[PDB]
């Protein structure tokens, strides 16, 4: 085989050139933009090859760690556009550190706890910042952040009684949920609701009445899921929908066959990463939204007794995804991003890493099979495909809260 | 009156007409996390927003204030919510507000709050007369703006404006036939009007799509639409289609075509087709071809299909 200091890459095989776009000599904005990215990605790919010498890929853990550690405390005014998403910035950054297996100092953890306490609304849930009305986006983030910390201090900050009432004040009769009082409706809300409801153990039989049916109505002709019935299939909304139904144990309400074929077709044959919608550009953050769908599907199919399921791999190109993230998505200065030419940000950092972890780890039943491309150190901590927080963290939290009664219900 | 960037703009803490109310600083606690180093202007406006909100001051001054808070951060849903409360309490001219939102959306077309705001305004006025034209302008700048398409579907369905959408669809498909958001809108318009059960409609669509496939063979959108409008009934239900594709294969053996063929075989085997052994064999050969050469990025998916076919139809 190869010496330990050289590792052949899928993206560098001579035949990989064949995967370049074929625009049938008919150019439109779509092919033109796709070709441009491909041109840049080929350049990047080539920079990691030195004829028959192909050095091991390296995740720059330390540079990332220092970028994160800084942001957890302070952020420039460039983040003014996320002032209504601070608990979300919390979750992004903590999960990134979690994935990187970088410990959280007791002091920082307690400060985060207090901050999230200040963001909790008296009517229940969490807002984008202190004094802000509650919103499922930040509510989702705030609960995940508290579960990543996993201390009883963190756990108890959540006012479960009001949280349930808040979920109720957003429930629509057709099964859907508003994102916040007087707000917009789409599948993100069903996933936020179910995520926090199941973790904190506050699910009542009626809370999610008609929700699975509503989510199914969101799967479309493409096979993926849209934000609302009728809209285009989209990686983000699709992750939201499936994970929500997995929580409700209703995955069967969807055409899993069309969904599987849709999502696998979303991995770019040349880039190795995922696009969010058919005929759109590759983007590092979909590495999780899209690729994350495979483990959910595997679980759904496995529960149905599918005899043809793999016992060692996810139904996507795990290596290819790892090559896209490691060679195209890292900022030399630390942090990860969309694609070469884009600037870093905590959102992309969180999700690029989330996907890299799903791409390196396979698990099903008593079967575990890792595929860590590059230097061994690249290995990231596993992540729960439904909640996207440490699997250990999910178990700890659910165990804790299962010990408390469902607020005012029996 | 005066914008945040106007030369004559004056911080709220310096405005005489605001002197009577004390600004409410944001309480981030003694040891802040994810603390944003706001600009003086930003903090100024938010300290005063906090004040009016805390006091629930339904005033014209507060209403003007939200406009500045929104320009500072249009993603702040709390401001938006309060703004709508004021629109009602003060009985503001909603047509004036529509012009406002129109400008806002033009500046930031990928924001959730702005579109939701415009939908609320259209609900209140029960007036969609400006919708299609406006949306079309947004789409003219970004043909695939998701929020734009979603809003358009809502307007059409809620106010039953189907009459000219299919034409719109063709227009855009001519501009960029790779626009997946447009193929979706097509399914949206047809399934909601004539439906696809009319066999004359189905044939028109199958023809149109095949014609687009011939013009641009590697355009995945068309292929997905073809499989989309025929899948429910069953790909194996359309025997001529298989023949046509088999004829094009030697000259257009793209992964899309080969894949479509496996999809057909799949459905055939599922409906007790004749020559089961022969069909299975051709299907497995294609799965291998896609996994090893034509669509390797999906090697695992194809290998799975291969095994599924065997577990379901080997006998």
């Amino acid at each position: 085989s190869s010496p330990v200091w050289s590792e052949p890459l899928y993206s560098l095989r001579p035949e990989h050139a064949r995967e370049r776009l074929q625009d049938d000599s008919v150019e439109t904005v779509t092919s033109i933009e796709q070709a441009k990215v491909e041109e840049k990605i080929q350049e990047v790919f080539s920079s990691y090859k030195f004829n028959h010498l192909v050095p091991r890929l390296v995740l720059q853990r330390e540079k990332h760690f220092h970028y994160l550690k800084r942001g957890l405390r302070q952020l420039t005014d460039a983040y003014e556009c996320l002032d209504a998403s601070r608990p979300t910035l919390c979750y992004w950054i903590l999960h990134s550190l979690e994935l990187l297996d970088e410990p959280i100092p007791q002091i920082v953890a307690t400060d985060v706890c207090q901050f999230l306490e200040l963001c909790q609304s008296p009517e229940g849930g969490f807002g984008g910042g202190p004094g802000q009305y509650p919103h499922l986006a930040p509510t989702y983030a705030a609960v995940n952040a508290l579960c990543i910390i996993g201390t009883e201090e963190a756990y108890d900050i959540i006012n479960r009684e009001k949280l349930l009432q808040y979920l109720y004040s957003l429930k629509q009769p057709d099964g859907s949920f508003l994102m916040h009082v007087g707000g917009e409706v789409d599948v993100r809300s069903a996933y936020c609701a179910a995520s926090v409801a199941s973790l904190t153990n506050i699910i009542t039989p009626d809370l999610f009445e008609g929700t699975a049916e509503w989510i199914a109505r969101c799967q479309n002709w493409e096979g993926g899921i849209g934000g609302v019935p009728g809209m285009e299939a989209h990686g983000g909304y699709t992750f939201c929908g499936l994970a929500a139904l997995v929580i409700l144990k209703r995955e069967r309400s969807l055409n899993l066959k069309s969904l599987l074929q849709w999502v696998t077709s979303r991995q770019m044959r040349f880039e190795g990463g995922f696009q969010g919608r058919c005929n759109k550009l590759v983007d590092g953050c979909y590495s999780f939204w899209q690729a994350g769908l495979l483990p959910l599907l595997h679980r759904a199919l496995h529960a149905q007794g599918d005899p043809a399921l793999s016992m060692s791999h996810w139904m996507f190109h795990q290596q290819a995804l790892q090559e896209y993230i490691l060679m195209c998505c890292q900022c030399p200065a630390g942090g990860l991003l969309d694609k070469p030419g884009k600037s870093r940000d905590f959102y992309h950092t969180c999700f690029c890493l989330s996907g890299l972890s799903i791409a390196q780890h396979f698990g099903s039943g008593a079967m575990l099979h890792d595929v860590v491309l590059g230097v061994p150190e690249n290995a990231l901590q596993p992540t729960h495909p439904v909640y996207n927080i440490g699997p250990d963290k999910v178990i700890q939290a659910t165990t804790y809260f299962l010990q408390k009664p469902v607020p005012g219900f029996e | 009156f005066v914008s945040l960037d106007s030369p004559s703009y004056v911080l709220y803490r310096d405005r005489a007409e605001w002197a009577d109310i004390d600004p409410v600083p944001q309480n981030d606690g003694p040891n802040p996390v994810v603390q944003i180093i706001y600009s003086d202007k930003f903090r100024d406006v938010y300290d005063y927003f906090r004040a009016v909100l805390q006091r629930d001051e339904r005033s014209e001054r507060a209403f003007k204030l939200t406009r500045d808070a929104i320009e500072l951060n249009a993603a702040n849903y709390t401001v938006w919510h309060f703004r709508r409360v004021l629109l009602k309490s003060l009985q503001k001219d909603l047509h004036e507000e529509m012009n406002y939102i129109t400008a806002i959306i033009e500046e930031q077309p990928k924001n959730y709050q702005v579109w939701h705001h415009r939908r609320v305004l259209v609900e209140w006025l029960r007036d969609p007369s400006q919708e299609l034209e406006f949306i079309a302008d947004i789409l003219n700048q970004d043909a695939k703006n998701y929020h734009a398409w979603q809003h358009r579907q809502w307007v059409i369905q809620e106010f039953k404006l189907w009459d000219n959408e299919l034409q719109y669809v063709d227009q855009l498909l001519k501009e960029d036939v790779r626009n997946n958001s447009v193929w979706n809108q097509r399914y949206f318009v047809i399934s909601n009007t004539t439906g696809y059960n009319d066999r004359a409609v189905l044939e028109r669509e199958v023809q149109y799509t095949l014609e687009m496939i011939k013009l641009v063979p590697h355009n995945e959108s068309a292929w997905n639409y073809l499989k989309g409008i025929l899948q429910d009934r069953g790909l194996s239900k359309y025997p001529n289609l298989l023949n046509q594709l088999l004829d094009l294969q030697p000259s257009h053996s793209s992964p899309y075509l080969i894949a479509f063929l496996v999809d057909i075989y799949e459905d055939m085997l599922e409906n007790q087709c004749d020559n089961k052994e022969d069909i299975l064999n051709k299907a497995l050969e294609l799965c291998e071809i896609l996994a090893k050469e034509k669509d390797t990025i999906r090697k695992e998916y194809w290998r799975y299909i291969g095994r599924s076919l065997q577990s379901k139809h080997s006998t």
Partner: peptide, 4 residues
């Protein structure tokens, strides 16, 4: 890329 805004989530909310």
């Amino acid at each position: 890329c805004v989530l909310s």
